[PDB]
Amino acid sequence: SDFVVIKALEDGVNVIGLTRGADTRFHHSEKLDKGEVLIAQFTEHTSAIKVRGKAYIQTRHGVIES
Amino acid sequence: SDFVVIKALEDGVNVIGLTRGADTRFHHSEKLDKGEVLIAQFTEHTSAIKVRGKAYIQTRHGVIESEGKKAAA
Amino acid sequence: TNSDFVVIKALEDGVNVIGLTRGADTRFHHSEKLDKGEVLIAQFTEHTSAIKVRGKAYIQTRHGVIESE
Amino acid sequence: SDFVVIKALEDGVNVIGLTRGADTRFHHSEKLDKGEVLIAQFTEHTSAIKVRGKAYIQTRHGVIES
Amino acid sequence: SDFVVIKALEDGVNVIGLTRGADTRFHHSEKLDKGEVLIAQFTEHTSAIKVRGKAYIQTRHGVIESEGKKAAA
Amino acid sequence: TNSDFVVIKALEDGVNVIGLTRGADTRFHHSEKLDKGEVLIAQFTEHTSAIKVRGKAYIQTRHGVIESE
Amino acid sequence: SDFVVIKALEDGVNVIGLTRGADTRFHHSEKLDKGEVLIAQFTEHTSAIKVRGKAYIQTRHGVIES
Amino acid sequence: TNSDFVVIKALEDGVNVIGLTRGADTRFHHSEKLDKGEVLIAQFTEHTSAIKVRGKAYIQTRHGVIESE
Amino acid sequence: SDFVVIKALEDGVNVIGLTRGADTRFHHSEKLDKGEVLIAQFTEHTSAIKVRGKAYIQTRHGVIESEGKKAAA
Amino acid sequence: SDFVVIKALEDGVNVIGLTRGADTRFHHSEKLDKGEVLIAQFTEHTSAIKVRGKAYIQTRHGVIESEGKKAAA
Amino acid sequence: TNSDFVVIKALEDGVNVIGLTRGADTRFHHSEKLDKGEVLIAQFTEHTSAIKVRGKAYIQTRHGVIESE
Amino acid sequence: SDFVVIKALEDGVNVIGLTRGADTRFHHSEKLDKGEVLIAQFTEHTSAIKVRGKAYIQTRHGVIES
Numbered sequence: 001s002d003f004v005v006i007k008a009l010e011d012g013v014n015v016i017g018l019t020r021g022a023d024t025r026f027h028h029s030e031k032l033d034k035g036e037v038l039i040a041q042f043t044e045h046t047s048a049i050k051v052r053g054k055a056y057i058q059t060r061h062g063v064i065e066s
Numbered sequence: 067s068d069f070v071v072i073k074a075l076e077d078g079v080n081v082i083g084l085t086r087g088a089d090t091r092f093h094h095s096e097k098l099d100k101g102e103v104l105i106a107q108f109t110e111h112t113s114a115i116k117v118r119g120k121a122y123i124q125t126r127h128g129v130i131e132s133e134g135k136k137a138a139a
Numbered sequence: 140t141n142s143d144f145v146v147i148k149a150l151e152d153g154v155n156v157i158g159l160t161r162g163a164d165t166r167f168h169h170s171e172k173l174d175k176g177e178v179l180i181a182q183f184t185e186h187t188s189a190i191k192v193r194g195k196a197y198i199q200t201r202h203g204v205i206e207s208e
Numbered sequence: 209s210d211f212v213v214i215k216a217l218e219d220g221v222n223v224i225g226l227t228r229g230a231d232t233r234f235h236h237s238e239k240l241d242k243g244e245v246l247i248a249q250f251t252e253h254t255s256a257i258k259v260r261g262k263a264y265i266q267t268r269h270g271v272i273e274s
Numbered sequence: 275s276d277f278v279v280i281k282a283l284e285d286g287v288n289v290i291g292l293t294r295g296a297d298t299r300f301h302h303s304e305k306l307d308k309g310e311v312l313i314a315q316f317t318e319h320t321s322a323i324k325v326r327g328k329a330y331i332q333t334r335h336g337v338i339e340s341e342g343k344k345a346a347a
Numbered sequence: 348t349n350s351d352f353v354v355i356k357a358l359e360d361g362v363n364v365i366g367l368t369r370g371a372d373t374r375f376h377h378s379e380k381l382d383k384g385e386v387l388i389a390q391f392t393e394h395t396s397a398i399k400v401r402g403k404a405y406i407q408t409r410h411g412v413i414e415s416e
Numbered sequence: 417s418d419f420v421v422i423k424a425l426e427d428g429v430n431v432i433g434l435t436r437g438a439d440t441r442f443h444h445s446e447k448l449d450k451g452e453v454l455i456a457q458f459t460e461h462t463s464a465i466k467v468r469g470k471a472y473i474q475t476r477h478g479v480i481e482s
Numbered sequence: 483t484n485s486d487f488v489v490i491k492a493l494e495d496g497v498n499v500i501g502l503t504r505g506a507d508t509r510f511h512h513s514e515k516l517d518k519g520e521v522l523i524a525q526f527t528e529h530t531s532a533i534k535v536r537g538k539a540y541i542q543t544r545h546g547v548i549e550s551e
Numbered sequence: 552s553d554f555v556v557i558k559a560l561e562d563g564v565n566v567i568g569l570t571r572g573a574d575t576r577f578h579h580s581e582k583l584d585k586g587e588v589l590i591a592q593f594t595e596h597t598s599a600i601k602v603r604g605k606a607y608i609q610t611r612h613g614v615i616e617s618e619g620k621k622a623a624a
Numbered sequence: 625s626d627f628v629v630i631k632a633l634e635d636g637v638n639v640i641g642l643t644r645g646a647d648t649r650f651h652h653s654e655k656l657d658k659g660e661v662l663i664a665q666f667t668e669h670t671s672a673i674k675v676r677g678k679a680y681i682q683t684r685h686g687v688i689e690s691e692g693k694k695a696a697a
Numbered sequence: 698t699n700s701d702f703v704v705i706k707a708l709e710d711g712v713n714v715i716g717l718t719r720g721a722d723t724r725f726h727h728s729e730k731l732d733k734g735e736v737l738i739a740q741f742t743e744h745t746s747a748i749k750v751r752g753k754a755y756i757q758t759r760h761g762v763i764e765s766e
Numbered sequence: 767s768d769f770v771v772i773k774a775l776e777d778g779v780n781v782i783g784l785t786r787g788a789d790t791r792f793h794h795s796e797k798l799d800k801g802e803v804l805i806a807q808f809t810e811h812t813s814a815i816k817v818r819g820k821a822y823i824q825t826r827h828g829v830i831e832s
């Protein structure tokens with residue numbers, strides 16, 4: 001399955017998983033402090049991922065930094 | 067399964083999921099504040115995605131950037 | 140590549156993106172209005188086998204771009 | 209499935225679906241006025257598409273404009 | 275499933291579908307007037323397609339243009 | 348790539364495109380006549396496992412071109 | 417399935433199908449006269465093809481001419 | 483491409499590579515400590531659907547490199 | 552299913568099919584005279600092919616030409 | 625099924641297989657002396673591999689060389 | 698790519714190409730002798746999971762060439 | 767399945783197959799003398815291969831020589 005790479009560029013970045021299915025709510029928020037990296041898949045439970053805070057992000061479509 | 071990457075370039079960008087099926091309504095609107103990013107898949111429940119507000123958008127087909135670049139890729 | 144979609148960015152107000160029914164019959168089942176700079180990323184689906192766009196729009200598909208509309 | 213992109217370059221372009229199966233007749237004609245775009249799949253019901261009028265057409269094989 | 279793109283460059287171009295099976299007959303002839311386009315698939319019923327008349331033709335294998343370009347691609 | 352086909356353009360009158368039967372036996376089952384500039388796009392099929400072309404023709408297959416015949 | 421393209425460069429070229437299975441014998445010989453083309457698949461009945469006479473041959477591996 | 487993995491090389495002592503549980507709940511199930519120059523090649527699996535790395539590390543995934551950490 | 556192309560560059564080139572299974576024997580030797588070509592598949596019965604005699608050989612892995620070119624491809 | 629190539633550049637390089645499942649322990653450590661090579665797959669039993677010691681490592685994602693090159697590929 | 702094979706051209710007399718048995722046990726099951734310029738195109742199979750070549754040979758596999766032996 | 771190519775660059779190179787499954791032990795060691803080549807698959811019984819001695823090795827990931 002597809003995955004996303006997120007590197008926090010400041011303290012307190014949040015990577016938030018939104019629930020798969022008819023209903024949509026946040027099911028988990030992972031905090032990242034400056035420099036820390038999360039590599040996260042889309043899954044049975046997660047069909048959208050929201051990133052809050054300054055981050056460098058890689059997906060299959062390329063890079064987004066800031 | 068395809069996904070879209072959306073970066074908000076203003077506050078209050080709305081990423082709107084429309085229902086898969088005979089009927090089309092929005093089932094969810096996810097708000098993004100400036101600089102926030104949403105990576106959203108098409109799914110059993112969402113077969114079209116509408117973005118309202120200045121956004122930088124990447125899909126498999128390329129990049130669309132409000133008031134900026136539009137490039138096939 | 141087991142599902143495809145179209146990207147539509149409105150270049151003026153009042154753009155419409157219209158889904159045509161899959162099957163023996165062909166009728167408009169939904170028209171989605173876009174104002175200037177709004178983006179619709181829409182799949183072909185069990186219910187939609189053709190998409191019509193009216194108004195000035197920038198469109199991306201697997202086949203490339205059609206712009207300045 | 210394969211799809212075709214058609215942009216009308218004048219008013220009154222017609223995109224016509226021809227029926228799949230042993231019999232061949234037109235089952236639908238979609239009118240396009242100048243500048244309007246139809247993105248149409250091949251389907252269970254449509255195995256050939258005919259375009260009448262001045263159009264810019266994209267398929268997997270490339271572009272045909274005029 | 276393969277398809278062919280045919281553009282008529284004169285009136286009365288005939289795109290002829292021949293029957294899939296032990297026997298070969300034409301089951302349909304679709305007439306194109308000049309500048310009209312037919313995008314036709316091979317199918318359960320059509321296993322060969324004959325084009326009579328000046329036409330610009332694209333397939334997976336390339337382009338054939340009456341009195342013009344023939345290019346592999 | 349789950350089915351293949353051959354493109355044959357006649358460069359003179361009286362070109363023949365001939366299908367040979369699939370199976371233990373091999374016989375001509377159909378000859379299709381092409382006049383100058385006529386095009387045949389023909390698949391390999393349940394019934395046709397070899398194709399013979401006689402006369403001057405431009406031919407395209409997955410393997411490339413054979414022309415000036 | 418794979419196929420071979422053979423163009424006869426002189427009269428009397430023979431394209432010969434050899435039988436698939438434990439036994440190997442010629443099951444068919446197609447004669448080609450100068451300029452004629454045979455496009456032949458590997459099949460249930462044919463697992464090797466022999467070309468006799470001057471020919472220009474294309475396969476997935478490239479061209480052999482002479 | 484029916485399974486993916488991440489390569490993590492520690493650029494300092496005390497790097498941690500942390501697996502997050504697959505499923506409705508998300509919790510750290512294992513933290514693997516790496517000292518300077520140690521390498522972990524770790525798959526996504528039935529039990530691990532997200533990986534967190536803390537500390538200075540060079541990382542390779544299918545999407546490319548993230549370094550100087 | 553892979554195949555090999557063999558062109559004989561002398562008379563009496565032997566293309567030898569060896570048996571698929573626990574045991575290895577030649578089950579067939581096809582003789583090629585100079586300039587003849589054999590396009591032979593691996594099959595349920597043939598899991599190795601030996602060529603004896605000057606030959607130009609193409610496979611998926613490249614070209615081997617007796618007293619000439621050897622090239623990966 | 626992915627595999628990793630590990631070349632030891634000192635004695636006593638340890639290639640450590642960690643267990644596939646809810647629990648993570650090392651089930652095996654294969655020692656390599658300088659210049660020895662291990663080509664190891666991920667498997668039903670091994671879902672992560674740890675390398676301790678100076679090593680030249682190749683995977684699908686590229687090359688990592690202790691005190692040397694790191695290159696995506 | 699659902700089956701692979703190796704190409705071996707002997708560059709001297711007495712080259713041997715040796716098949717090693719697939720399964721729990723590993724033993725030579727066949728040695729095929731090649732004289733100078735003879736070519737063997739040999740698959741991996743239900744019975745052969747490793748191939749040993751002794752003597753001077755030019756070899757092609759999916760991974761490239763190994764020559765001047 | 768994947769395979770490895772090993773060419774011995776000195777006498778007495780050993781190519782060692784390690785067992786697939788929960789247990790890991792050497793199940794076979796093939797000796798190669800200078801210049802000899804082993805082309806070895808990963809299999810039901812072999813999920814890791816160890817090479818001892820000076821060798822030129824090719825895999826899908828490239829070459830390692832020395």
Ligand SMILES: N[C@@H](Cc1c[nH]c2ccccc12)C(=O)O
Pocket residue numbers: 015016017018028029030040041042043044045046049502503504505506507508509531532
């Ligand atoms: N338990 C979550 C873990 C996860 C994967 N990707 C995520 C993205 C954001 C938050 C959590 C996750 C799941 O399997 O779905």
Ligand SMILES: N[C@@H](Cc1c[nH]c2ccccc12)C(=O)O
Pocket residue numbers: 018019020021022023024025047048081082083084094095096106107108109110111112115
């Ligand atoms: N619960 C929604 C989450 C979602 C995915 N993509 C979206 C796009 C827009 C809005 C919501 C979503 C679903 O699985 O479909």
Ligand SMILES: N[C@@H](Cc1c[nH]c2ccccc12)C(=O)O
Pocket residue numbers: 084085086087088089090091113114156157158159169170171181182183184185186187190
């Ligand atoms: N309910 C519609 C939503 C949709 C998808 N693609 C569209 C294109 C145009 C209009 C509506 C749509 C469907 O699933 O088919």
Ligand SMILES: N[C@@H](Cc1c[nH]c2ccccc12)C(=O)O
Pocket residue numbers: 159160161162163164165166188189223224225226236237238248249250251252253254257
């Ligand atoms: N109801 C038609 C819609 C359609 C798809 N492609 C077309 C091309 C032309 C006309 C109509 C169509 C169908 O599903 O087949």
Ligand SMILES: N[C@@H](Cc1c[nH]c2ccccc12)C(=O)O
Pocket residue numbers: 226227228229230231232233255256289290291292302303304314315316317318319320323
């Ligand atoms: N009813 C025909 C339509 C068709 C498809 N391709 C064609 C080419 C030529 C003529 C007719 C056709 C069929 O499904 O086969």
Ligand SMILES: N[C@@H](Cc1c[nH]c2ccccc12)C(=O)O
Pocket residue numbers: 292293294295296297298299321322364365366367377378379389390391392393394395398
């Ligand atoms: N009825 C023939 C039509 C055909 C396809 N390809 C051909 C090539 C040559 C002659 C006839 C054909 C068939 O289905 O097999």
Ligand SMILES: N[C@@H](Cc1c[nH]c2ccccc12)C(=O)O
Pocket residue numbers: 367368369370371372373374396397431432433434444445446456457458459460461462465
């Ligand atoms: N009846 C033969 C036709 C054929 C295909 N390829 C050939 C090559 C040579 C001779 C005959 C053939 C078969 O289906 O196998």
Ligand SMILES: N[C@@H](Cc1c[nH]c2ccccc12)C(=O)O
Pocket residue numbers: 434435436437438439440441463464566567568569579580581591592593594595596597600
């Ligand atoms: N009857 C043999 C024909 C054959 C195919 N490839 C070969 C190579 C060499 C000799 C014979 C063959 C078989 O099907 O296996």
Ligand SMILES: N[C@@H](Cc1c[nH]c2ccccc12)C(=O)O
Pocket residue numbers: 569570571572573574575576598599714715716717727728729739740741742743744745748
């Ligand atoms: N009977 C052997 C033939 C063979 C194929 N590849 C080989 C390599 C070496 C020696 C023999 C072979 C087999 O099917 O396995």
Ligand SMILES: N[C@@H](Cc1c[nH]c2ccccc12)C(=O)O
Pocket residue numbers: 499500501502512513514524525526527528529530533642643644645646647648649671672
């Ligand atoms: N037992 C864990 C091992 C593992 C794989 N990838 C990981 C990443 C981080 C931590 C542990 C792991 C699992 O199979 O899931």
Ligand SMILES: N[C@@H](Cc1c[nH]c2ccccc12)C(=O)O
Pocket residue numbers: 717718719720721722723724746747781782783784794795796806807808809810811812815
């Ligand atoms: N009998 C062993 C043969 C083998 C394949 N690859 C190897 C690598 C090393 C040692 C032996 C082997 C097996 O099938 O697994």
Ligand SMILES: N[C@@H](Cc1c[nH]c2ccccc12)C(=O)O
Pocket residue numbers: 639640641642652653654664665666667668669670673784785786787788789790791813814
């Ligand atoms: N018996 C182990 C062998 C193994 C494969 N890859 C490894 C990596 C490290 C240590 C051991 C291994 C297994 O099949 O999983």
